[PDB]
Amino acid sequence: TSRRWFHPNITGVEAENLLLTRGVDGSFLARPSKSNPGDFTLSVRRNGAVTHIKIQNTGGYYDLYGGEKFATLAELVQYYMEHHGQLKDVIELKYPLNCADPTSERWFHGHLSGKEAEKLLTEKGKHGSFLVRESQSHPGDFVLSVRTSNDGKSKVTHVMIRCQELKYDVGGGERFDSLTDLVEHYKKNPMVETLGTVLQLKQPLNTTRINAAEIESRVRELSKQGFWEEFETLQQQECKLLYSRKEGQRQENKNKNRYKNILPFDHTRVVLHDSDYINANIIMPEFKKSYIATQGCLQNTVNDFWRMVFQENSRVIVMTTKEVERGKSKCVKYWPDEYALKEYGVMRVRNVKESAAHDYTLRELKLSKVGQGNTERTVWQYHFRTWPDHGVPSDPGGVLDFLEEVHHKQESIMDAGPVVVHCSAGIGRTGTFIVIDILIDIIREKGVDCDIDVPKTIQMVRSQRSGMVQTEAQYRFIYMAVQHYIETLQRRIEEE
């Protein structure tokens, strides 16, 4: 279940040519926009002509022009192929035109020497750890290095991959049209050595896990792009997370979603104890603070939101957007005015005090159940207001100082439930805040000598809610926030 319809290194022209020379009517491909960085293009072939459809991502979701809104490109493609439709009057999405480029695959390392691959497999790798690198002695050819410390019970085996007439082979048998086709076949049908050893391609070698103290070196390496390559490699793994979202698709729940196709996964969704539906998922860091990643309140979901906050015993709400951003509502006001008391169905909310800071507004709320003896608990709502209208903040200090306060508030309340985090779709900005908070919590407790892995943490969060962390700008910001936090901690060590 690998993502093949995405072509990362082609121009609009090359897309038009590929679909007219290799494809037919119904053939399609997705590619990054060369003209609009961060955006994407859906190139579909129809009636002997190629139509380019714009896919915008402002940081909250994927917006298909003339189409609908989605959490990932894989969920967009799955929707129009399993099988729905779009206008500009139909555009048929029938045949995914496969990409032969291996650059964005986890196992591919490109220009890497034999000695480098050997040391990396002996130190980082274990049983079934594999990689594909370019051959220095044989230009055009590739080398597959597989692992199956002085005992000699483990070994590194090298398999030659010949590239002949745009096709790849292991010196015999089948000739594959792409390096990915070769890997998928031998991952399924492992190569057997003449003496019995099975060359199992279990997992690719991890090249993203770094020690927290060496962040400055990794940031410098990714800046001169590295950040783009790492993010595009992370996007190639989204086809593995197409979990069922049946509850969100139900007719009785359709209007409970801000965006029709941005739904919670069934296995992680928040189930309301007596309707059990809310577009929210429990985010549990897996490698102990937990989170609720949710959409901005709808007028008809305000009562359900408070039902969720009450039942989960949540004491901290992180609001990442303003009520209206760029002329479109991101969240409905679900809290009463300062000093006022309001009833939201069975729930009662008192806005005790509003405290304004530079980057945020803090609202001390008192949540209770109507007609029920001491159900009252203080809910601290942290409203972040300085996130720019376009892109990410230029300085990570604001977000970090805010999350440090949010963390300390959460820790000060014994048996406090998951931290509620929300933005527009509850995926982009929400995903960014949650990932940063998870990463800084590892460093805060375990120290600067603990290992961190930015894309692996994101993938783990993405398996719990669709498309958590939307853009490359947000991905780069996570690295900038972690680096700033470490720099701050090292300055503390120096000054006391």
Short mmCIF file of C-alpha atoms in Angstrom, two decimals:
data_model
loop_
_atom_site.label_atom_id
_atom_site.label_comp_id
_atom_site.label_asym_id
_atom_site.label_seq_id
_atom_site.Cartn_x
_atom_site.Cartn_y
_atom_site.Cartn_z
CA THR A 1 0.00 0.00 0.00
CA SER A 2 2.67 2.52 -1.17
CA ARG A 3 1.86 6.01 -2.53
CA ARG A 4 2.73 5.97 -6.28
CA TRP A 5 0.53 8.63 -8.00
CA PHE A 6 2.62 11.50 -6.45
CA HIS A 7 5.43 12.89 -8.68
CA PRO A 8 7.65 15.22 -6.55
CA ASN A 9 10.27 16.43 -9.10
CA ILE A 10 8.36 17.25 -12.32
CA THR A 11 7.12 20.50 -13.93
CA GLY A 12 3.57 21.08 -15.27
CA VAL A 13 4.86 20.46 -18.84
CA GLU A 14 6.45 17.04 -17.96
CA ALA A 15 3.12 16.07 -16.29
CA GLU A 16 1.20 16.98 -19.50
CA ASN A 17 3.71 14.94 -21.61
CA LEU A 18 3.69 11.84 -19.29
CA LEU A 19 -0.15 11.66 -19.32
CA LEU A 20 -0.23 12.01 -23.16
CA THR A 21 2.60 9.45 -23.83
CA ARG A 22 2.12 6.89 -20.97
CA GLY A 23 -1.47 7.57 -19.84
CA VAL A 24 -5.02 7.40 -21.29
CA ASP A 25 -8.42 9.10 -20.60
CA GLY A 26 -8.89 8.75 -16.84
CA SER A 27 -5.14 8.79 -16.04
CA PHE A 28 -4.05 11.14 -13.24
CA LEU A 29 -1.15 12.27 -11.02
CA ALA A 30 -0.49 14.69 -8.13
CA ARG A 31 2.56 17.01 -8.01
CA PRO A 32 3.79 19.98 -5.86
CA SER A 33 3.05 23.41 -7.33
CA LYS A 34 6.29 24.90 -8.73
CA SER A 35 4.52 28.31 -9.09
CA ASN A 36 2.72 28.22 -5.68
CA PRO A 37 5.09 26.68 -3.02
CA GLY A 38 3.12 24.68 -0.45
CA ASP A 39 0.22 24.12 -2.90
CA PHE A 40 -0.34 21.05 -5.15
CA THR A 41 -1.70 20.26 -8.65
CA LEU A 42 -3.98 17.39 -9.75
CA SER A 43 -3.12 16.71 -13.44
CA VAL A 44 -5.91 14.60 -15.05
CA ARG A 45 -5.97 13.36 -18.68
CA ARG A 46 -9.38 13.61 -20.44
CA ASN A 47 -10.45 13.52 -24.15
CA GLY A 48 -6.81 13.56 -25.37
CA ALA A 49 -6.06 16.68 -23.26
CA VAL A 50 -4.49 17.35 -19.81
CA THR A 51 -6.42 19.43 -17.19
CA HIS A 52 -4.50 20.94 -14.23
CA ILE A 53 -6.56 21.26 -11.00
CA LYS A 54 -5.27 23.48 -8.14
CA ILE A 55 -4.98 22.03 -4.56
CA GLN A 56 -4.33 24.78 -1.97
CA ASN A 57 -3.12 24.23 1.64
CA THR A 58 -3.13 27.44 3.78
CA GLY A 59 -2.10 25.43 6.87
CA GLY A 60 -5.47 24.02 7.92
CA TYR A 61 -6.50 21.61 5.09
CA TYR A 62 -6.19 20.61 1.40
CA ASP A 63 -8.64 22.66 -0.74
CA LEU A 64 -9.34 21.10 -4.16
CA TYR A 65 -10.49 23.84 -6.59
CA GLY A 66 -13.97 22.96 -7.82
CA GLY A 67 -13.86 20.07 -5.34
CA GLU A 68 -14.00 19.73 -1.54
CA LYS A 69 -11.72 19.93 1.56
CA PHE A 70 -9.47 17.09 2.77
CA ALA A 71 -6.99 16.17 5.55
CA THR A 72 -4.43 14.44 3.21
CA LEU A 73 -3.81 13.99 -0.58
CA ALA A 74 -4.34 10.21 -0.05
CA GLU A 75 -7.83 10.88 1.45
CA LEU A 76 -8.58 13.29 -1.48
CA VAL A 77 -7.57 10.61 -4.09
CA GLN A 78 -9.40 7.80 -2.15
CA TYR A 79 -12.63 9.93 -2.07
CA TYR A 80 -12.80 10.56 -5.88
CA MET A 81 -11.82 6.86 -6.55
CA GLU A 82 -13.96 4.84 -4.03
CA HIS A 83 -16.01 6.35 -5.97
CA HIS A 84 -17.35 9.95 -5.81
CA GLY A 85 -17.08 12.88 -8.28
CA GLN A 86 -16.08 16.46 -9.20
CA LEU A 87 -17.17 19.31 -11.57
CA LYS A 88 -15.32 20.88 -14.65
CA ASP A 89 -19.63 18.15 -15.79
CA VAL A 90 -17.36 15.24 -14.68
CA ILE A 91 -13.57 14.70 -14.35
CA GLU A 92 -12.90 10.93 -14.07
CA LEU A 93 -10.15 9.72 -11.68
CA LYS A 94 -9.55 6.18 -13.01
CA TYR A 95 -5.86 5.27 -13.43
CA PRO A 96 -3.08 6.44 -11.07
CA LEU A 97 0.00 7.16 -13.24
CA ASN A 98 2.84 5.66 -11.14
CA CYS A 99 6.04 7.59 -10.37
CA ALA A 100 9.43 5.84 -10.83
CA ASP A 101 11.36 8.41 -8.66
CA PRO A 102 12.66 6.76 -5.41
CA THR A 103 14.01 10.00 -3.70
CA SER A 104 11.05 10.38 -1.27
CA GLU A 105 11.14 6.71 -0.09
CA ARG A 106 12.40 5.94 3.49
CA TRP A 107 14.83 3.18 2.31
CA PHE A 108 16.45 5.32 -0.46
CA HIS A 109 19.68 7.15 0.50
CA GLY A 110 20.99 8.32 -2.91
CA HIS A 111 24.67 9.36 -2.94
CA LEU A 112 26.01 7.25 -0.04
CA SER A 113 29.25 5.21 0.18
CA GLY A 114 29.60 1.52 1.15
CA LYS A 115 31.52 2.36 4.36
CA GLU A 116 28.83 4.90 5.45
CA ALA A 117 25.95 2.38 4.91
CA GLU A 118 27.94 -0.35 6.75
CA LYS A 119 28.53 1.79 9.91
CA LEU A 120 24.87 3.05 9.90
CA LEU A 121 23.48 -0.54 9.73
CA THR A 122 25.86 -1.86 12.44
CA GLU A 123 25.02 1.03 14.84
CA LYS A 124 21.37 2.07 14.09
CA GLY A 125 19.99 -1.00 12.26
CA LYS A 126 18.90 -4.42 13.59
CA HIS A 127 17.34 -7.62 12.04
CA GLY A 128 15.66 -6.90 8.69
CA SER A 129 17.06 -3.33 8.48
CA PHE A 130 17.63 -2.40 4.81
CA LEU A 131 18.66 0.52 2.55
CA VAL A 132 19.15 1.36 -1.16
CA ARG A 133 22.13 3.56 -2.17
CA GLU A 134 23.76 4.70 -5.44
CA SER A 135 26.80 2.69 -6.68
CA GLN A 136 30.05 4.74 -6.95
CA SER A 137 32.01 2.11 -8.98
CA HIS A 138 29.03 1.38 -11.32
CA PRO A 139 27.32 4.67 -12.42
CA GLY A 140 23.55 4.31 -12.82
CA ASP A 141 23.48 1.10 -10.70
CA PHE A 142 22.29 0.71 -7.06
CA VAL A 143 23.24 -1.32 -3.94
CA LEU A 144 20.78 -2.96 -1.48
CA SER A 145 22.38 -3.35 1.98
CA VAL A 146 20.47 -5.71 4.35
CA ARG A 147 21.17 -6.57 8.04
CA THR A 148 20.15 -10.06 9.30
CA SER A 149 28.61 -6.69 18.64
CA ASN A 150 31.72 -8.94 18.19
CA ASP A 151 29.79 -12.26 18.54
CA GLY A 152 29.30 -12.54 14.77
CA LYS A 153 25.64 -13.70 14.95
CA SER A 154 24.56 -10.69 12.78
CA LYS A 155 25.78 -9.58 9.29
CA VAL A 156 25.49 -6.92 6.51
CA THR A 157 24.75 -8.36 3.01
CA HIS A 158 25.08 -6.28 -0.22
CA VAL A 159 22.88 -7.01 -3.29
CA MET A 160 23.62 -5.34 -6.67
CA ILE A 161 20.77 -3.58 -8.52
CA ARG A 162 21.49 -3.09 -12.24
CA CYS A 163 19.76 -0.30 -14.18
CA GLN A 164 19.36 -1.33 -17.81
CA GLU A 165 17.03 0.40 -20.38
CA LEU A 166 15.07 2.32 -17.61
CA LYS A 167 14.51 -1.06 -15.78
CA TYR A 168 15.89 -2.53 -12.51
CA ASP A 169 16.95 -6.12 -11.62
CA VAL A 170 19.07 -8.14 -9.09
CA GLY A 171 21.16 -9.76 -11.90
CA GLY A 172 18.49 -12.33 -12.78
CA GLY A 173 14.79 -13.04 -13.24
CA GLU A 174 12.24 -10.19 -13.31
CA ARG A 175 13.02 -6.67 -14.61
CA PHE A 176 11.12 -3.93 -12.75
CA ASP A 177 10.01 -0.56 -14.20
CA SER A 178 11.01 1.20 -10.93
CA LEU A 179 13.25 0.80 -7.83
CA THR A 180 10.06 0.92 -5.63
CA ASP A 181 8.57 -1.99 -7.69
CA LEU A 182 11.80 -3.98 -7.05
CA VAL A 183 11.76 -3.22 -3.25
CA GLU A 184 8.01 -4.12 -2.84
CA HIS A 185 8.55 -7.47 -4.66
CA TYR A 186 11.61 -8.48 -2.57
CA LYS A 187 9.92 -7.20 0.66
CA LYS A 188 7.14 -9.74 -0.16
CA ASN A 189 9.32 -12.49 -1.81
CA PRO A 190 12.73 -12.29 0.03
CA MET A 191 15.99 -13.30 -1.67
CA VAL A 192 17.50 -16.56 -0.40
CA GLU A 193 21.28 -16.96 -0.23
CA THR A 194 22.73 -20.21 -1.69
CA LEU A 195 23.48 -21.35 1.93
CA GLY A 196 19.97 -20.73 3.41
CA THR A 197 20.03 -17.13 4.76
CA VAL A 198 16.71 -15.27 4.09
CA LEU A 199 17.23 -11.59 3.12
CA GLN A 200 14.12 -10.17 4.84
CA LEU A 201 13.33 -6.53 4.01
CA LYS A 202 11.49 -5.84 7.30
CA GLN A 203 11.94 -2.07 7.93
CA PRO A 204 14.03 0.79 6.38
CA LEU A 205 17.03 2.22 8.28
CA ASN A 206 16.04 5.20 10.47
CA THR A 207 17.97 8.32 9.40
CA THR A 208 15.78 10.96 11.19
CA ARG A 209 16.23 10.11 14.93
CA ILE A 210 18.76 12.54 16.49
CA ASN A 211 20.04 13.29 19.99
CA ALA A 212 18.38 16.47 21.40
CA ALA A 213 21.81 18.08 22.14
CA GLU A 214 22.89 17.89 18.43
CA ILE A 215 19.78 19.78 17.07
CA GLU A 216 21.91 22.78 15.82
CA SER A 217 23.93 20.47 13.48
CA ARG A 218 20.77 18.72 12.12
CA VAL A 219 18.99 22.12 11.62
CA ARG A 220 22.10 23.46 9.73
CA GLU A 221 22.16 20.30 7.52
CA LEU A 222 18.39 20.45 6.69
CA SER A 223 18.58 24.24 5.95
CA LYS A 224 21.15 23.97 3.09
CA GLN A 225 16.30 21.52 0.62
CA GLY A 226 16.71 18.96 3.45
CA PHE A 227 13.52 20.08 5.30
CA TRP A 228 11.51 19.61 2.05
CA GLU A 229 13.00 16.14 1.32
CA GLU A 230 12.28 14.96 4.91
CA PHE A 231 8.70 16.37 4.76
CA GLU A 232 8.02 14.82 1.29
CA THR A 233 9.33 11.45 2.66
CA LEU A 234 6.84 11.79 5.58
CA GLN A 235 3.99 12.52 3.06
CA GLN A 236 4.80 9.24 1.19
CA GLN A 237 3.75 7.28 4.34
CA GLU A 238 0.15 8.68 4.43
CA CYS A 239 -1.32 5.74 2.42
CA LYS A 240 -0.60 3.50 5.48
CA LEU A 241 -3.00 5.62 7.65
CA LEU A 242 -6.29 5.34 5.66
CA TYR A 243 -8.25 4.05 8.73
CA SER A 244 -12.09 3.87 8.85
CA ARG A 245 -14.09 7.04 9.70
CA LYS A 246 -17.61 5.42 9.44
CA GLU A 247 -19.19 7.36 12.36
CA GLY A 248 -18.30 10.75 10.83
CA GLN A 249 -19.80 9.64 7.47
CA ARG A 250 -23.26 8.84 9.05
CA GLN A 251 -26.22 11.07 7.98
CA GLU A 252 -27.05 12.00 11.64
CA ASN A 253 -23.42 13.26 12.10
CA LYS A 254 -22.83 15.07 8.73
CA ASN A 255 -23.76 18.55 10.10
CA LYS A 256 -21.61 17.97 13.26
CA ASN A 257 -18.50 18.31 10.98
CA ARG A 258 -17.14 21.77 10.00
CA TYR A 259 -15.66 20.13 6.86
CA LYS A 260 -17.66 17.21 5.37
CA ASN A 261 -14.56 15.08 4.53
CA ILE A 262 -12.27 15.91 7.52
CA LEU A 263 -13.44 13.17 9.89
CA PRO A 264 -12.13 11.50 13.11
CA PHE A 265 -10.79 7.90 12.97
CA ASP A 266 -13.27 5.41 14.54
CA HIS A 267 -10.61 3.69 16.73
CA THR A 268 -9.43 6.99 18.39
CA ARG A 269 -12.61 9.21 18.25
CA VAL A 270 -14.02 10.67 21.50
CA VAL A 271 -17.18 8.66 22.34
CA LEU A 272 -19.77 10.65 24.36
CA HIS A 273 -21.52 8.82 27.24
CA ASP A 274 -25.33 9.30 27.36
CA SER A 275 -25.73 10.94 20.62
CA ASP A 276 -22.09 9.81 21.12
CA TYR A 277 -20.58 11.92 18.27
CA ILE A 278 -18.01 14.75 18.23
CA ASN A 279 -15.31 15.47 15.58
CA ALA A 280 -12.45 14.87 18.08
CA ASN A 281 -9.72 12.26 18.67
CA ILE A 282 -7.66 11.33 21.73
CA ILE A 283 -3.95 11.86 20.92
CA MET A 284 -1.82 9.53 23.06
CA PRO A 285 1.99 9.86 22.57
CA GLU A 286 3.39 6.36 21.90
CA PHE A 287 7.12 5.53 21.95
CA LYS A 288 2.06 10.65 30.56
CA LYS A 289 0.16 13.64 29.07
CA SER A 290 -2.67 13.05 26.52
CA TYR A 291 -4.50 15.47 24.16
CA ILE A 292 -7.83 15.98 22.42
CA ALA A 293 -7.30 17.29 18.87
CA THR A 294 -10.63 18.77 17.74
CA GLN A 295 -12.23 21.16 15.21
CA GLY A 296 -13.38 24.68 16.06
CA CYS A 297 -16.92 24.69 17.54
CA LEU A 298 -19.99 24.84 15.28
CA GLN A 299 -23.14 26.60 16.66
CA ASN A 300 -24.84 23.12 16.89
CA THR A 301 -21.73 21.40 18.45
CA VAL A 302 -21.12 23.87 21.36
CA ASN A 303 -23.19 21.70 23.79
CA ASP A 304 -21.36 18.51 22.63
CA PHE A 305 -17.96 20.23 23.13
CA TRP A 306 -18.79 20.97 26.80
CA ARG A 307 -20.16 17.39 27.20
CA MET A 308 -16.72 16.17 25.97
CA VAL A 309 -14.71 18.55 28.27
CA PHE A 310 -16.84 17.41 31.26
CA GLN A 311 -16.75 13.61 30.61
CA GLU A 312 -12.98 13.50 29.85
CA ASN A 313 -12.18 15.63 32.98
CA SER A 314 -10.27 18.13 30.78
CA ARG A 315 -8.98 21.20 32.65
CA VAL A 316 -6.97 22.97 29.93
CA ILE A 317 -8.20 24.21 26.53
CA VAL A 318 -5.69 25.40 23.91
CA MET A 319 -7.39 27.61 21.30
CA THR A 320 -4.93 28.22 18.43
CA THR A 321 -7.07 30.50 16.19
CA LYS A 322 -9.21 33.66 16.44
CA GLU A 323 -13.04 33.34 15.94
CA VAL A 324 -12.63 34.68 12.34
CA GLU A 325 -9.32 34.47 10.38
CA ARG A 326 -8.88 35.72 6.74
CA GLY A 327 -12.65 36.42 6.46
CA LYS A 328 -13.85 32.91 7.40
CA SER A 329 -15.00 31.50 10.77
CA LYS A 330 -12.53 29.06 12.37
CA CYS A 331 -14.33 28.74 15.76
CA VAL A 332 -17.69 29.84 17.24
CA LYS A 333 -17.61 31.58 20.69
CA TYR A 334 -18.38 28.64 23.04
CA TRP A 335 -17.51 30.54 26.26
CA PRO A 336 -19.52 33.31 28.07
CA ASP A 337 -18.40 36.98 28.35
CA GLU A 338 -16.20 37.93 31.40
CA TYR A 339 -18.12 37.55 34.76
CA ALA A 340 -21.16 36.04 32.95
CA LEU A 341 -22.72 32.59 33.48
CA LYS A 342 -24.32 30.59 30.62
CA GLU A 343 -26.04 27.22 30.18
CA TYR A 344 -24.95 25.02 27.25
CA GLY A 345 -27.61 22.30 27.40
CA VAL A 346 -26.95 20.16 30.51
CA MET A 347 -23.64 22.03 31.09
CA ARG A 348 -23.16 25.34 32.96
CA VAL A 349 -20.12 27.62 32.33
CA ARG A 350 -18.96 30.65 34.40
CA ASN A 351 -16.27 32.99 32.95
CA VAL A 352 -14.57 33.87 36.29
CA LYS A 353 -11.68 36.07 35.06
CA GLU A 354 -9.99 37.05 31.77
CA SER A 355 -6.20 37.67 31.93
CA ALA A 356 -4.56 39.16 28.83
CA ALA A 357 -0.87 38.54 27.98
CA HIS A 358 1.14 39.57 24.85
CA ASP A 359 0.67 36.39 22.76
CA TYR A 360 -2.50 35.05 24.42
CA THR A 361 -5.67 35.59 26.53
CA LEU A 362 -6.26 33.33 29.56
CA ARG A 363 -9.89 32.66 30.57
CA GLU A 364 -10.61 31.09 33.97
CA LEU A 365 -13.81 29.07 33.48
CA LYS A 366 -15.95 27.12 35.99
CA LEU A 367 -17.73 24.15 34.37
CA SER A 368 -20.55 22.24 36.17
CA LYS A 369 -23.59 20.07 35.31
CA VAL A 370 -27.10 21.60 35.82
CA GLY A 371 -29.08 20.32 38.84
CA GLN A 372 -26.17 18.10 39.96
CA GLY A 373 -24.30 18.33 43.29
CA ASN A 374 -20.66 19.55 43.02
CA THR A 375 -19.78 18.64 39.41
CA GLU A 376 -17.94 22.01 39.42
CA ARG A 377 -14.30 22.15 38.23
CA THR A 378 -12.08 24.96 36.94
CA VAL A 379 -11.32 24.82 33.18
CA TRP A 380 -8.41 27.07 32.09
CA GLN A 381 -8.82 28.26 28.48
CA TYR A 382 -5.59 29.46 26.78
CA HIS A 383 -6.45 31.51 23.65
CA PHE A 384 -3.36 32.03 21.39
CA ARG A 385 -3.87 35.23 19.29
CA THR A 386 -0.44 36.06 17.69
CA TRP A 387 -0.23 33.27 15.04
CA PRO A 388 0.17 35.17 11.70
CA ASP A 389 -2.66 35.22 9.06
CA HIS A 390 -0.19 33.64 6.59
CA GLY A 391 2.53 31.11 7.39
CA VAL A 392 4.07 30.34 10.82
CA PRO A 393 5.44 32.75 13.55
CA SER A 394 8.91 34.15 12.66
CA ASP A 395 10.10 33.52 16.29
CA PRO A 396 9.27 30.25 18.19
CA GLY A 397 9.61 31.95 21.63
CA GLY A 398 5.94 33.01 21.76
CA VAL A 399 4.57 29.47 21.16
CA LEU A 400 7.17 27.99 23.62
CA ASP A 401 6.49 30.46 26.49
CA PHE A 402 2.74 29.77 25.96
CA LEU A 403 3.17 25.93 26.03
CA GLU A 404 5.39 26.17 29.17
CA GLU A 405 2.50 27.97 30.96
CA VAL A 406 -0.06 25.46 29.55
CA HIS A 407 2.19 22.56 30.76
CA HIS A 408 2.59 24.05 34.30
CA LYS A 409 -1.20 24.64 34.58
CA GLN A 410 -1.89 21.01 33.50
CA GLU A 411 0.72 19.60 35.96
CA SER A 412 -0.68 21.69 38.88
CA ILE A 413 -4.08 19.86 38.68
CA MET A 414 -3.98 16.25 40.01
CA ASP A 415 -5.80 13.60 37.83
CA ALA A 416 -6.48 16.24 35.06
CA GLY A 417 -7.78 14.80 31.78
CA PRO A 418 -6.45 15.33 28.22
CA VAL A 419 -5.47 18.88 27.07
CA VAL A 420 -8.05 20.07 24.49
CA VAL A 421 -6.34 21.58 21.41
CA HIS A 422 -8.35 23.20 18.57
CA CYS A 423 -8.05 25.24 15.34
CA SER A 424 -10.20 25.25 12.11
CA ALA A 425 -10.17 21.56 11.02
CA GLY A 426 -8.25 20.54 14.17
CA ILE A 427 -5.35 19.09 12.13
CA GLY A 428 -2.77 21.70 10.98
CA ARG A 429 -2.15 24.32 13.68
CA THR A 430 -3.57 21.83 16.29
CA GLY A 431 -1.12 19.15 15.05
CA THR A 432 1.81 21.61 15.17
CA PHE A 433 1.11 22.67 18.82
CA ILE A 434 0.61 19.02 19.95
CA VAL A 435 3.83 17.75 18.23
CA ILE A 436 5.92 20.66 19.69
CA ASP A 437 4.42 20.00 23.18
CA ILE A 438 5.19 16.23 22.95
CA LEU A 439 8.81 16.93 21.86
CA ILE A 440 9.50 19.61 24.51
CA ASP A 441 8.03 17.33 27.26
CA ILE A 442 10.60 14.57 26.36
CA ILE A 443 13.45 17.17 26.68
CA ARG A 444 11.98 18.76 29.89
CA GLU A 445 11.91 15.45 31.87
CA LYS A 446 14.45 13.02 30.27
CA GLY A 447 16.96 15.81 29.49
CA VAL A 448 18.87 17.07 26.41
CA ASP A 449 20.62 13.67 26.09
CA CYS A 450 17.43 11.83 25.04
CA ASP A 451 16.77 10.87 21.40
CA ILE A 452 14.05 12.66 19.39
CA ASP A 453 12.57 11.91 15.95
CA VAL A 454 10.42 14.73 14.44
CA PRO A 455 8.78 12.87 11.43
CA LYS A 456 8.31 9.59 13.39
CA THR A 457 6.48 11.53 16.17
CA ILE A 458 4.24 13.18 13.47
CA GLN A 459 3.45 9.77 11.81
CA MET A 460 2.50 8.38 15.30
CA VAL A 461 0.18 11.43 15.84
CA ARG A 462 -1.22 11.07 12.24
CA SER A 463 -2.31 7.44 12.99
CA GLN A 464 -4.57 8.93 15.73
CA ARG A 465 -6.12 11.82 13.67
CA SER A 466 -5.99 12.39 9.85
CA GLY A 467 -3.28 14.73 8.48
CA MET A 468 -1.90 16.09 11.80
CA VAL A 469 0.72 18.79 10.81
CA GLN A 470 -0.40 20.10 7.35
CA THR A 471 2.48 22.07 5.75
CA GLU A 472 6.31 22.10 5.28
CA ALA A 473 6.27 25.60 6.91
CA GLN A 474 4.69 24.02 10.08
CA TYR A 475 7.15 21.03 9.88
CA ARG A 476 10.14 23.44 9.70
CA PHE A 477 8.60 25.50 12.57
CA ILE A 478 8.52 22.34 14.81
CA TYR A 479 12.34 21.96 14.27
CA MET A 480 12.82 25.72 14.97
CA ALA A 481 10.72 25.43 18.20
CA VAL A 482 12.71 22.37 19.45
CA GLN A 483 16.10 24.12 18.67
CA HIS A 484 15.00 27.39 20.41
CA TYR A 485 13.86 25.36 23.50
CA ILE A 486 17.27 23.54 23.71
CA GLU A 487 19.19 26.85 23.22
CA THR A 488 17.09 28.33 26.10
CA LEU A 489 17.84 25.30 28.36
CA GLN A 490 21.61 25.45 27.60
CA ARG A 491 21.57 29.21 28.43
CA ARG A 492 19.97 28.23 31.83
CA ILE A 493 22.74 25.58 32.48
CA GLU A 494 25.35 28.32 31.70
CA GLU A 495 23.69 30.98 33.95
CA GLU A 496 23.39 29.00 37.31
#
